[PDB]
């Protein structure tokens, strides 16, 4: 029913937490996304008081380059990130937002609860 779908998988590792994402074109048509900088996504890890614990974007510099990307019918754009410190046990939420903009598409974002144990 939705043309594009973003999935998030959060996996607790020994030294860190890993986030695997896949932006999937489920439509029958190719879809173009445009970006105004090199940055492809944003990822933010919220705690139970909605304070930010991690932001992919902090500590990074992106080129001010326009980009033009086509996701074919069925194609996925796969991407991941590592949060380099396990926090304390509890439930958290990761919100990934895709920075590419498709004509006649709401911006693509997903959220995902995950427990650190």
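Sequence proposed for the structure above (117 residues):
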């Amino acid at each position: 029913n939705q043309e594009v779908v973003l999935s998030i998988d959060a996996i607790q590792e020994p030294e860190q937490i890993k986030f695997n994402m896949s932006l999937k074109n489920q439509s029958e048509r190719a879809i173009e996304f445009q970006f105004s900088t090199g940055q492809k996504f944003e990822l933010v890890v919220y705690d139970s008081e909605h304070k930010e614990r991690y932001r992919y974007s902090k500590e990074k510099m992106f080129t001010q380059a326009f980009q033009n990307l086509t996701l074919e019918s069925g194609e996925t754009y796969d991407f991941s990130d590592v949060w380099k410190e396990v926090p304390e046990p509890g439930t958290y939420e990761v919100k990934v937002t895709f920075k590419g903009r498709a004509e006649n598409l709401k911006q693509v974002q997903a959220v995902q609860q995950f427990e650190v144990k």
